[PDB]
Ligand binder design. Structure first.
Ligand SMILES: [Cu+2]
Ligand SMILES: [Cu+2]
Ligand SMILES: [Cu+2]
Ligand SMILES: [Cu+2]
Lengths: 560, 541
């Protein structure tokens, strides 16, 4: 760490005047001051992003812990590989410590920002305001992006992430505000990341031209544009919002109400009882009612924010594809929204813990991993007086890290809060249809394309052999993203089954699936086990398999 | 002041330098090798000009301010804006305006060299400045399957050389990507504040970035949705997106027709102006108007429920603020080039029909030049720029008149039916609107663009209690041959009655606006008259 010693991750230090400050919803937090906390976050994160590569607390090196360029951090060796020779970073994916590794990672980022806020105040704030500004730094916590809450009719990226510039206070010049580049909009380096000084160049597990990016992008990388466009492909936040609002195709027809699948999934995750930690925490699969898990929802959000398809076959005037950092595990942590996403993944973990309090590494699968060192994160152990790595039990109570969430302050009201935030639209629309539920189970290998990402799209009815991609594609039901031992996910299917039955004289639909690669082509040799399951009764008030999945064929020009 | 507009001064080592296609030029600058001196000069000079203060009349703000808002004086000429629209001096007023911009950039390049280039490098950098001319955006050429905005306009940053620091290239904000001020344009010091579309709430120019129902702070910089602009630029009939059909972008067909149709007089070619034939309504200014709309976006909202949001507004659609977007000047550079091409193949047609003759000697305020005969400062006049080479630039395509027809064919052309459209720019009191034409049933909730069922093409009213000049209207023309062939095929051979909807900036149909639309067939004969289509109740203005 800086100054030649380990960096001890503690969370923001405890101050008696600041009891368990909350991580706020970033839109609420922004809307209430659109101002010292905003200024402090902007100015601190700007300094962190501008730090040199040799500074381990630079934004680059902190994002670098997750994946590429796979260097050491805080004295902990990097350059790890898989059994097959593939490079890997420190982040935990497809394992039961996924939530706890990321809990610590988010806290590291928050703590580094707080320390940068204190330094900013020391260097910039006049004597008359120092206590005031220190007081706000001590109350500030990393905001979360509530990807499943309707923004102030639809799910959206945070307001702040969609603003290229932001107005900040100038300490010492009351009333004076300056518009500055918004460090939440993108992370920009001074050159292409493929040409950074050794050993930090971003070079290739990926096929997208991330080596040719200077800035992070959302949907900005498309084939057949000049390679200099990829230096900064922009923030197509409107396109990301569209993806975030994925729902069955039939709901865009007149006379049908839509429900965002991400909100339905999140409401199911938080309200379904009876899952053990191993079921909730991860996609890892070594019963299908229990395959709706935190990591699978998180994987879909990564895809929807960044985009993963670089090309599409054929001629299209409207180009709905485009790729970006958030879809790709080796580089997703460079996009500033990454941390806000993972802050909400931490919040969802804390909510689920609160309403499943006996379910902590409590199954035979996850028990094995409970004691894993969460490298590279150090802490001082006061019992043995040694610097050690974090372990999951160290962060079981997130409040040990001196932050909390509003929703977890009161267990007795949390079930109504979950329903108010995430369940109203689902119940509104489900209420109109009979008392039964349908779900799709999805099981795949994250390695089926040799580690390359892919998207599993499911359809009810005939598939358009040139359009098998998204909610605009005829008969689309939903998607599962391999944000790359098996992996599982689950999709709601209740509403899409109703529409299909109405069109097909009551027949149960065969789920049809297509595995789509980053070139927009169908992969014919990626195995997916898809099934449709039914129970009597609504989920928010005994599932049986009612149809087996089948691979759909696509047009010859669209085959991998 | 006065600022004498001359074009870049002549230097015998640089005979009549050409204004290059900006994509070709960008590729030469960045691919040929690492010696990107012209690119560096243009980027650095334009950055300096954009950062000059408002009381400097050679600041980017003030040069863009000549066109429209904030409607102030320029060069001692009292401050509608100075730009000429819907009149026969549209091409010549804009010829001088583009030359002013090029000249100011050149002078700033010389200043950059004086400031930053070591003595022993000055001759080399000056040589590149003297060869440089303002590149044009060829909006009708397939980009190096489709029409596109310039590569360089779609890049947030651009790498430049640092003179005297060999090999060091630095990444800088690209001044062609946007014009960004330090505050919202509605809060600039009097008298410069820009203060419907919320342009007063913008700090930066935007393409499709202003949408209703987002936080107003998003409008400060709505971004550059160049993919969405490119989609608009490739507008064509809806049926061409069905499986099995070839597409042809209407803009390229229109541009080919403009350049190759013979027999137009200057009044027909130069402007939308119709002073009280339809075969001759394909004119320079109408094509230019559609490109303004397609680059910027004009619709702030849309009624109803839509997950896919294809609307969004921005500066290029709006006469009062379009000149702030740096692509404005590259668009107008190509409009100047199309004018020079048409002049070359129609050499006796210059303000000498009974309609356009009256405007030939209009002073092109506020642009000054020195008159050699009287030794007096005077305003530019059209005849002063009839030969664009007198301003010491040329285009490759006009350097060889003998090969021009084949070049036009190679670039843009690789019975007939046409649509005629005659409208008042003041049908909505001067507000902009879009005239969409359909063959067949119109979808009452989707009457907007090529994704709308049975769409054939559009005409954009680039304008903005108030009325048009008495006796004056505006005309445009659309190709319709392929669209009529499809309609007949699907409808038992019926010749379609053109159906039109007039769309406002809220995405609503203006039921009270009447436009004259007709279909003509080849010796063109009128074969069907247009009628307004109704839309859904929730989508009616
Ligand atoms: Cu991760
Ligand atoms: Cu993640
Ligand atoms: Cu103009
Ligand atoms: Cu114009």
């Amino acid at each position: 760490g800086p100054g030649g010693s380990p960096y001890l991750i503690t969370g923001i230090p405890k101050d008696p005047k600041h009891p368990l400050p909350i991580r706020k919803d970033i839109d609420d937090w922004y809307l209430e001051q659109t101002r010292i906390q905003l200024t402090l976050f902007v100015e601190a994160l700007t300094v962190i992003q501008n730090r040199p590569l040799n500074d381990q607390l630079s934004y680059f090196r902190l994002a670098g812990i997750h994946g590429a360029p796979w260097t050491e951090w805080d004295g902990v060796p990097g350059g790890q590989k898989d059994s097959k020779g593939n490079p890997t970073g420190f982040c935990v994916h497809n394992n039961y410590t996924f939530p706890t590794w990321h809990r610590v990672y988010v806290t590291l980022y928050e703590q580094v920002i707080y320390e940068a806020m204190l330094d900013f105040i020391k260097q910039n704030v006049p004597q008359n305001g120092k206590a005031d500004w220190e007081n706000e730094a001590k109350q500030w916590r990393l905001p979360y992006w509530d990807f499943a809450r309707f923004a102030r009719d639809e799910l959206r990226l945070p307001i702040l992430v969609t603003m290229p510039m932001v107005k900040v206070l100038v300490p010492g010049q009351p009333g004076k505000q300056l518009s500055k580049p918004n460090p939440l909009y993108r992370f920009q380096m001074q050159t292409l990341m493929g040409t950074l000084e050794r050993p930090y160049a971003i070079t290739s597990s990926f096929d997208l031209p991330f080596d040719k990016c200077q800035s992070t992008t959302k949907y900005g990388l498309l084939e057949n544009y000049n390679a200099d466009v990829w230096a900064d492909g922009g923030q197509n936040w409107l396109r990301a919002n569209l993806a975030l609002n994925e729902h069955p195709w039939y709901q865009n027809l007149d006379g049908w109400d839509s429900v965002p699948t991400l909100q339905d999934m999140t409401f199911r995750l938080l309200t379904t009882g009876g899952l053990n930690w191993g079921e909730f925490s991860s996609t890892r699969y070594d019963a299908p009612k229990n395959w709706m898990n935190l990591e699978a929802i998180h994987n879909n959000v990564h895809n929807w924010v960044g985009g993963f398809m670089f090309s599409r076959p054929g001629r299209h005037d409207l180009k709905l594809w485009g790729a970006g950092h958030m879809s790709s595990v080796p580089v997703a942590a460079y996009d500033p929204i990454f941390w806000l996403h993972h802050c909400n993944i931490d919040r969802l973990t804390a909510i689920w813990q609160t309403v499943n309090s006996g379910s902590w590494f409590n199954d035979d699968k996850s028990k094995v991993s409970k004691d894993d060192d969460l490298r590279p994160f150090h802490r001082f152990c006061e019992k043995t007086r040694k610097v050690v790595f974090f372990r999951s039990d160290d962060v079981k109570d997130w409040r040990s890290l001196n932050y909390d969430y509003a929703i977890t302050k009161d267990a007795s009201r949390i079930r109504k809060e979950i329903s108010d935030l995430y369940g109203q639209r689902t119940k509104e629309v489900y209420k109109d249809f009979g008392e039964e539920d349908y779900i799709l189970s999805i099981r795949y290998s994250r390695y089926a394309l040799g580690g390359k990402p892919f998207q599993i799209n499911i359809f009810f009815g005939d598939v358009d052999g040139k359009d098998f991609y998204d909610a605009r594609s005829q008969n689309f039901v939903g998607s599962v993203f391999n944000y790359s031992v098996l992996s599982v996910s689950q999709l709601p299917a209740r509403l899409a089954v109703h529409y299909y039955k109405k069109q097909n004289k009551g027949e149960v639909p065969t789920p049809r699936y297509v595995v789509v690669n980053s070139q927009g082509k169908a992969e014919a040799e990626v195995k997916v086990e898809v099934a449709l399951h039914k129970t009597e009764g609504t989920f928010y008030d005994d599932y049986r398999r009612v149809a087996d999945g089948k691979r759909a064929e696509v047009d010859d020009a669209y085959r991998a």
